[PDB]
Enzyme design. Structure first.
Site, PDB file in Angstrom:
ATOM      1  N   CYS A   1      -5.248   0.197   3.755  1.00  0.00           N
ATOM      2  CA  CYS A   1      -5.282  -1.170   4.365  1.00  0.00           C
ATOM      3  C   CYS A   1      -6.707  -1.749   4.252  1.00  0.00           C
ATOM      4  O   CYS A   1      -6.842  -2.931   3.866  1.00  0.00           O
ATOM      5  CB  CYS A   1      -4.748  -1.147   5.793  1.00  0.00           C
TER       6      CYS A   1
ATOM      7  N   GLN B   1       0.854  -1.209   0.000  1.00  0.00           N
ATOM      8  CA  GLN B   1       0.000   0.000   0.000  1.00  0.00           C
ATOM      9  C   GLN B   1       0.884   1.252   0.000  1.00  0.00           C
ATOM     10  O   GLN B   1       0.344   2.334  -0.183  1.00  0.00           O
ATOM     11  CB  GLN B   1      -0.960  -0.024   1.189  1.00  0.00           C
TER      12      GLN B   1
ATOM     13  N   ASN C   1      -1.384  -9.241   4.992  1.00  0.00           N
ATOM     14  CA  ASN C   1      -1.246  -7.776   5.171  1.00  0.00           C
ATOM     15  C   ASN C   1      -1.040  -7.126   3.797  1.00  0.00           C
ATOM     16  O   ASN C   1      -0.731  -7.850   2.846  1.00  0.00           O
ATOM     17  CB  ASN C   1      -0.061  -7.481   6.091  1.00  0.00           C
TER      18      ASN C   1
ATOM     19  N   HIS D   1      -6.427  -1.409  12.063  1.00  0.00           N
ATOM     20  CA  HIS D   1      -5.704  -1.837  10.827  1.00  0.00           C
ATOM     21  C   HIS D   1      -6.440  -3.013  10.170  1.00  0.00           C
ATOM     22  O   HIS D   1      -6.536  -4.074  10.814  1.00  0.00           O
ATOM     23  CB  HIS D   1      -4.225  -2.141  11.121  1.00  0.00           C
TER      24      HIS D   1
END
Ligand code: Q1Q
EC number: 3.4.22.27
Lengths: 222, 220
Positions: A26, A20, A185, A165
């Protein structure tokens, strides 16, 4: 009987790990990841979807500020209301707020609805990851131990349910007794285990992983 | 003429790397780090000073919100106004906002003044690191590339002068042509190169390293 281990990567439902950069997208990556899996389940084809599309086009309407943050649930909503989202190939990620370039010409998937799971239920979450597919979740990542993780099962004594997150649960298992969630992630291949973190499972909703879980469904794409 | 390389660790002026945990006390660590060096230069003794002291006691009056952030300059101010700061041993770090617990009997250093350096001047910063000691700085650390750094010289194309993270310049050099600042962080030994990151130097005030530099002095 739910298996001891699930890894949705084995079943070709998870795209390459994205990066990102400095853009706080996120939430966009969590949402596209969940739908990427539902797309592979319906069509049999693995296609990276445009997180950029969500940053540019899923804005004021409910409560997203592009590179300054947003929610996975409202990202799903936009995809329902727009009846589409473009492929990453057609609408590449540039890690900035750009003007909307959504349209159905390079459309790669749709979304009919999304399911919010009950707060803290790590047994329900396990059933969803086993039987439905990857699950969008929030975690508490305030702790340098989170960004510094390289391998093993992550246990942070100071972790909370106040999640900040957005990430994606692509599976679960145990490393020699220690039970874990397999988490994708959006920080690139150099974060944790090729972009994944194994987070403590059946240890009190650790870092609020099971706090706000959602997954989208595609009842009829065309 | 200034030396090509400087590493204040070689001259025993830098304490072990600390770990701020969930508390946004990077500014407190940067400030004690800078004064730790000045203390070693005056007394010849290396003593970890209390970041917790700054989080608890340098608050509303100094424009500091403890674990929600603050400035190194106003942290220095508090040490001048309090006429001391406690050792880390006497006043350990707990990574949360406590009420002031300062005790003058466990005072470990004082501070007579502090110098703010001019914005973006990487030649002035180099002069200060060479001739005065480690320098408290802010960096832009919002980029995953920063947290994820493992080794080499850090260059992030997307970096800005909008600094958000207090750290300490303990030296400078060049790795295979690439000029760098040697930066001590407060994220423990498992960040970067045992808690250090080499950040691009003479590359347009990269991540605003030279944006807000300050150093304290212990005069008399
Ligand atoms: N005139 C003041 C001097 C100190 C200062 N310090 C910072 C900073 C330092 C560390 C972390 C986050 C902000 N920002 C702005 C200023 C401006």
């Amino acid at each position: 009987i739910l298996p001891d281990s699930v890894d949705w990567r084995e079943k070709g439902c998870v795209t390459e790990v994205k990066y990102q950069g400095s853009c706080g997208a996120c939430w966009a990556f969590s949402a596209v990841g969940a739908l990427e899996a539902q797309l592979k389940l319906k069509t049999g084809k693995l296609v990276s979807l445009s997180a950029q599309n969500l940053v540019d086009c899923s804005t004021e309407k409910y409560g997203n500020k592009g590179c300054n943050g947003g929610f996975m649930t409202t990202a799903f909503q936009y995809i329902i209301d727009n009846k589409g989202i473009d492929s990453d190939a057609s609408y590449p990620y540039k890690a900035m707020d750009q003007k909307c370039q959504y349209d159905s010409k390079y459309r790669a998937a749709t979304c009919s609805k999304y399911t919010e799971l009950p707060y803290g239920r790590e047994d329900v979450l396990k059933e969803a990851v086993a039987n439905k597919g990857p699950v969008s979740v929030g975690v508490d990542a305030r702790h340098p131990s989170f960004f510094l993780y390289r391998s093993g099962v992550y246990y942070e004594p100071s972790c909370t349910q106040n999640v900040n997150h957005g990430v994606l649960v692509v599976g679960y298992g145990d490393l020699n007794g220690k039970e874990y969630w397999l988490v994708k992630n959006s920080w690139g291949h150099n974060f944790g285990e090729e972009g994944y973190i194994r987070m403590a499972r059946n240890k009190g909703n650790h870092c609020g992983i099971a706090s706000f879980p959602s997954y989208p469904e595609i009842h009829h794409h065309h």
